[PDB]
Design a protein around this motif. Structure first.
Motif, short mmCIF file in Angstrom:
data_model
loop_
_atom_site.label_atom_id
_atom_site.label_comp_id
_atom_site.label_asym_id
_atom_site.label_seq_id
_atom_site.Cartn_x
_atom_site.Cartn_y
_atom_site.Cartn_z
N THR A 60 22.97 23.30 -22.79
CA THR A 60 22.07 23.82 -23.81
C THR A 60 22.91 24.28 -24.97
O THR A 60 24.12 24.37 -24.88
CB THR A 60 21.32 25.06 -23.33
N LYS A 61 22.24 24.61 -26.07
CA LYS A 61 22.87 25.20 -27.22
C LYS A 61 23.85 26.31 -26.86
O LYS A 61 24.87 26.49 -27.54
CB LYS A 61 21.79 25.76 -28.14
N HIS A 62 23.55 27.04 -25.79
CA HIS A 62 24.37 28.18 -25.36
C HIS A 62 24.94 28.05 -23.95
O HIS A 62 25.25 29.06 -23.32
CB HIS A 62 23.55 29.47 -25.43
N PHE A 63 25.04 26.82 -23.46
CA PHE A 63 25.62 26.55 -22.14
C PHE A 63 26.48 25.31 -22.34
O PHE A 63 26.00 24.20 -22.19
CB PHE A 63 24.51 26.31 -21.10
N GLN A 64 27.71 25.53 -22.77
CA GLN A 64 28.69 24.48 -22.98
C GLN A 64 30.01 25.07 -22.65
O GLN A 64 30.28 26.23 -22.98
CB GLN A 64 28.73 24.02 -24.44
N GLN A 112 32.49 14.73 -25.59
CA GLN A 112 31.38 15.61 -25.22
C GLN A 112 30.42 15.79 -26.41
O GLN A 112 29.22 15.54 -26.28
CB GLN A 112 31.87 16.99 -24.76
N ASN A 113 30.96 16.18 -27.57
CA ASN A 113 30.14 16.46 -28.73
C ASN A 113 29.42 15.19 -29.23
O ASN A 113 28.28 15.24 -29.70
CB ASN A 113 30.98 17.08 -29.84
N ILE A 114 30.10 14.06 -29.15
CA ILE A 114 29.50 12.81 -29.60
C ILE A 114 28.33 12.48 -28.69
O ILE A 114 27.25 12.12 -29.15
CB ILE A 114 30.50 11.65 -29.65
N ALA A 127 16.66 23.53 -27.77
CA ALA A 127 17.97 24.09 -27.46
C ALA A 127 18.87 23.05 -26.80
O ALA A 127 19.67 23.38 -25.94
CB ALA A 127 17.82 25.36 -26.57
N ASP A 128 18.74 21.79 -27.23
CA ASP A 128 19.74 20.77 -26.87
C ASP A 128 21.17 21.23 -27.25
O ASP A 128 21.37 21.99 -28.19
CB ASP A 128 19.47 19.43 -27.55
N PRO A 129 22.17 20.77 -26.49
CA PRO A 129 23.55 21.23 -26.73
C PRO A 129 24.24 20.42 -27.86
O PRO A 129 25.43 20.11 -27.79
CB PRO A 129 24.22 20.99 -25.38
N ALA A 130 23.48 20.10 -28.90
CA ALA A 130 23.96 19.25 -29.98
C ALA A 130 24.48 20.09 -31.17
O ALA A 130 24.23 21.29 -31.26
CB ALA A 130 22.85 18.34 -30.43
#
Ligand SMILES: CC(=O)N[C@@H]1[C@@H](O)[C@H](O[C@@H]2O[C@H](CO)[C@@H](O)[C@H](O)[C@H]2NC(C)=O)[C@@H](CO)O[C@H]1O
Ligand SMILES: CC(=O)N[C@@H]1[C@@H](O)[C@H](O[C@@H]2O[C@H](CO)[C@@H](O)[C@H](O)[C@H]2NC(C)=O)[C@@H](CO)O[C@H]1O
Ligand SMILES: [Mg+2]
Ligand SMILES: [Mg+2]
Ligand SMILES: [Zn+2]
Ligand SMILES: [Zn+2]
Lengths: 403, 403
Positions: free
Chosen positions: B147-151, B187-189, B353-356
Motif C-alpha cells: 500500500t501507499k504506506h506498506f513498502q 519495485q517502483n516500476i 492507497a495503491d503503493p504507486a
C-alpha cells in the motif's frame, strides 16, 4: 455542436509527427495517435531519428497515445523479422497480404509495443494521456471492439494473395480470407485484455494504396470537410471505399456513433520525401481543415472520450453507455449520476458492457452468448446478470458447457 | 483462527510442480505460485517437459498464479542471454550477483513473462485465479509494495560481487549495492503498473543457498510449524536469516500483516533429483505440515486475498484497507459496505492507497509526499485528496515542482 470529429493519426512516431503535432497545437485540438514503437528502434524504414522527440511532444502536448502494435505486423510480410524487414516489405509493397497469421503472436505484438514505449520513455505511465494499454487499432483493419453490442470486423481488410487494388482481386465478406480470420481472433484477444479497438469513418488518404506518390493525392480541406459532412450519421464504415476499408456489419444507427466522425490519417503523409510533398502540401490542409471544421460547428475530441466518460450530475437514460476506468458500462435505469453511484462490478445502476468474451462480473448476458471460463467455453442458456457466485462451471441452470 | 498462512511457491512451473499441487489439493488448501515462464520454453535448466501441464494443473485446481519474471533475471547472470543461460548460471551459481542492472529491462521481464504464459496457454485470462498482471515477487528479494504506506525493500538481497554466503561478503543496508538499488526501481516500476509485490516471513529452505544438495536439509513439518508460530506477529522479515533475506525496514505491526505468515518455498525442492531426494523426503513434509497447521488453528489463504477483498455487507473502520479489482483502497469513513459503494477513483467512502508513485486520482496525499506527473516530479505542499481537476502542473498551491 454539429458533431464531434476524432482525428486519429496512425503509424507514428516518425520525424513527420513533430510538425503534425505542432499544427494540432496551433489549431487548438487534441488528437489520438496510434503508434508503432519499432520506429523508436530505428528499424521502421522511415525518417525516424526524431521518433522519441515526437512521442514526448505528443504526450507533453496532451494528445492521446494508443496501441497500433510494435511493428505493424511487418513480421508477417517477411520470411524472418529483423532490422531490414520494413525496407524489405516496402520493396514488395506486400503489407496487406498474409498480414495476420498466428493471432496469438500477432496480439503479442501489441504487448511488445508497450514494452518498447515504456523502455524509450520510462516515465510514460505518469501521463494520463498514455492509453497504450486501453485503446488500440489493428493495422490495415477497420475493425471495432467498443461494447458488448458494438463490435464488427473489416472483413476484406487483408488478403491471402492479391492486393485489393490489383486486377482479379475478389473478396467474399461471408467467407473472409485467412488473414482476416486471424485478425478477428486478434481483436478478441485484445478485448479480453480490456482493450477497446476502433476503426474509422473516413480516411485522409489516396484513393487506394496502389497509388504512386500517395502524399500527393490527399483531398483538399474543403472537399475533405464535405466528405466528413457526408459521413456524419450515414454509417460511413459500410459505404466507404475501397472495399478493404469497409466494416460490413458495422451497427448502423448505434447510439454511441451518433453525431460522430472518426478520421484516419497517417503521419507519414505529412512529409516531403519518398511519398510526395506531404509537408508542403498537406500540413496546410490539416491546419485549414481544423479551422473550417470548427466554423462549421464541429468540435474535436479524442478516442478516450469516444465512449463518453461517466460523469457525476449527468442524467443517463436506461441503456446508455459510458466509459469508466477503461471499462464500458450500460445504464440499467434512467437516473442522474451521483458521486457514489459509479459503475462497478456490483453497481445496481450499471452493467459491465465491455466487448470481451471471457466471463466477467455484472454483465447482462443473453441466451446464445458464449463465454470463456477457466479455459472452457460455455453457452449462456438463460439470460441473466452475472455475479461472483454464478460461475459458469457450477451454475448449470445459467450455463451449458460446449462440446 | 490463530492466524493465516500463505503458502507461496517460487520458480515454477516445472515437473516437480505437479506433485506439489496434488499434495496441496489432497490437503484441501490453495496456494500462490510465482512462476517464471522460461520453463515453458524449456530453457530454465530444470526437468520441465511437463511445465505446461503443471501450469494448467495449478490453474484448474484453483491456485493463484503470480508473476516472478520471465527468466528469474538470468539475463543478468550471463553476458548474452540464450537457451544455455540457465545452465550457465547454474554452473557458476552466481544468481545473487548483479541480479538487477538495468531496472527498465528487468521490469520488462515481468511483462515478457505474461506474453509467454499467454502464448502457451492462450485461454489463461479466462481464469480468475490468474493474477500474473496483478501480483508479483522479485527474484531473490524480500521486498514489498503493498500500500501507499506498506513498502519496504530487501537491502542485502543481491550483490555487486560475492555470493552472500561467501567469505569476504559484506552488506551495508545503509549503503545498498547497485543491484539492490536497481531492484528498488524495479519495485517502483512494477507498482506504477499496478502490481503489488510481497516478500515472505519464513522460507522453507536450506540454511543458505551455498549448501550442497539443498533439498536434503529441509526442516521437518513439526519444527517448521514452530518457525511459523514464532513468525506470527513478530516482524519476521526483520529477524529472518540469512542477511540477504531480510527486509530491514519492514513496517513492524503494520495492520495488514497482523496474524499472518507468508511462507516461501520452491517447487524444485520437492523433486527427487539433482538437489537431493525432494519428492521422497519433502512432499510428505508438506502434506503433514498442512495437516498439523490446520489442527493448530491456522487457515490457508492465497495472495489475492492478502489484502482482504472488498465485500458488500462487511463493516469497515476508517483507516482499514481492502483490495478491489486489483487496487488498494483505504476507508475514509467507518461504515457497512453496500452494493453501490464499491471503492473507486470517485468514491467518497474510500481513497486509493495503491503503493504507486505516479500521481493518481482520489489518493489522500500528505505534505511531503512526492508524485510523478507527465515526466516531472512534484512535492505535495498541502494535504488533499486528488481529483481530476487538481493535476500537479496546474496546482502550484498544492504541489511544488522539484528540480
Ligand atoms: C490503419 C492502417 O494500418 N492503415 C494501413 C496503413 O498503415 C498502410 O501503409 C503502410 O504502412 C506501413 C507501416 O507504417 C509502412 O511501412 C508502409 O510503407 C506503408 N505503405 C505505403 C505504400 O506507404 C497502408 C498501405 O499498406 O494500408 C492501410 O490500410
Ligand atoms: C523467490 C526467489 O527468488 N528465491 C531465490 C531462488 O530463486 C534462488 O535459487 C535459484 O533459482 C534459480 C531460478 O529458478 C535456479 O536457476 C537456480 O538453480 C536456483 N539455485 C539453486 C542452488 O538451486 C535462490 C538461490 O540462488 O535464492 C533465493 O533467494
Ligand atoms: Mg478496457
Ligand atoms: Mg494492483
Ligand atoms: Zn497502420
Ligand atoms: Zn525465485
Amino acid at each position: 455542436p454539429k458533431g464531434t470529429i476524432y482525428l486519429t493519426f496512425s503509424d507514428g512516431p516518425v520525424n513527420a509527427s513533430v510538425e503534425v503535432i505542432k499544427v494540432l497545437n496551433q489549431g487548438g485540438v487534441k488528437a489520438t495517435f496510434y503508434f508503432n514503437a519499432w520506429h523508436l528502434d530505428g528499424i521502421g524504414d522511415e525518417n525516424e531519428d526524431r521518433a522519441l522527440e515526437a512521442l514526448k511532444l505528443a504526450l507533453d502536448s496532451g494528445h492521446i497515445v494508443g496501441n497500433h502494435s510494435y511493428d505493424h505486423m511487418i513480421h508477417n510480410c517477411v520470411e524472418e523479422f529483423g532490422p531490414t524487414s520494413g525496407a524489405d516489405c516496402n520493396a514488395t509493397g506486400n503489407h496487406q497480404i498474409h498480414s495476420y497469421q498466428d493471432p496469438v503472436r500477432d496480439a503479442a505484438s501489441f504487448e511488445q509495443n508497450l514494452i518498447t514505449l515504456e523502455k524509450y520513455l520510462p516515465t510514460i505511465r505518469s501521463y494520463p494521456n498514455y492509453k497504450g494499454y486501453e485503446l488500440a487499432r489493428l493495422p490495415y483493419t477497420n475493425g471495432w471492439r467498443v461494447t458488448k453490442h458494438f463490435q464488427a470486423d473489416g472483413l476484406c481488410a487483408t488478403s491471402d494473395n492479391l492486393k485489393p487494388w490489383e486486377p482479379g482481386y475478389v473478396c467474399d465478406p461471408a467467407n473472409p480470407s485467412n488473414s482476416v480470420k486471424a485478425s478477428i481472433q486478434v481483436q478478441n484477444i485484445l478485448a479480453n485484455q480490456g482493450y477497446q479497438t476502433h476503426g474509422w469513418d473516413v480516411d485522409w488518404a489516396p484513393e487506394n494504396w496502389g497509388i504512386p506518390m500517395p502524399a500527393n493525392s490527399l483531398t483538399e480541406a474543403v472537399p475533405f470537410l464535405a466528405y466528413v459532412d457526408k459521413a456524419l450519421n450515414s454509417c460511413s464504415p459500410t459505404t466507404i471505399e475501397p472495399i478493404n476499408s469497409k466494416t460490413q456489419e458495422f451497427p448502423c444507427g448505434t447510439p454511441l456513433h451518433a453525431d460522430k466522425v472518426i478520421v484516419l490519417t497517417h503521419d507519414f503523409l505529412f512529409e516531403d520525401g519518398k511519398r510526395g510533398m506531404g509537408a508542403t502540401q498537406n500540413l496546410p490542409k490539416l491546419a485549414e481543415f481544423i479551422r473550417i471544421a470548427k466554423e462549421a460547428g464541429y468540435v474535436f475530441d479524442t478516442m478516450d472520450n469516444y465512449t463518453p466518460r461517466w460523469s457525476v450530475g449527468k442524467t443517463y437514460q436506461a441503456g446508455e453507455y459510458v466509459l469508466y476506468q477503461g471499462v464500458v458500462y450500460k445504464a440499467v435505469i434512467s437516473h442522474t449520476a451521483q458521486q457514489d453511484w459509479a459503475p462497478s462490478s456490483t453497481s445496481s445502476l450499471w452493467t459491465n458492457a465491455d466487448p470481451a468474451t471471457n466471463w466477467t462480473l455484472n454483465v447482462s448476458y443473453e441466451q446464445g452468448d458464449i463465454v470463456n471460463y477457466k479455459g472452457k467455453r460455455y453457452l449462456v442458456s438463460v439470460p441473466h446478470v452475472s455475479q461472483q457466485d454464478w460461475t459458469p462451471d457450477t451454475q448449470n441452470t445459467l450455463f451449458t458447457a460446449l462440446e
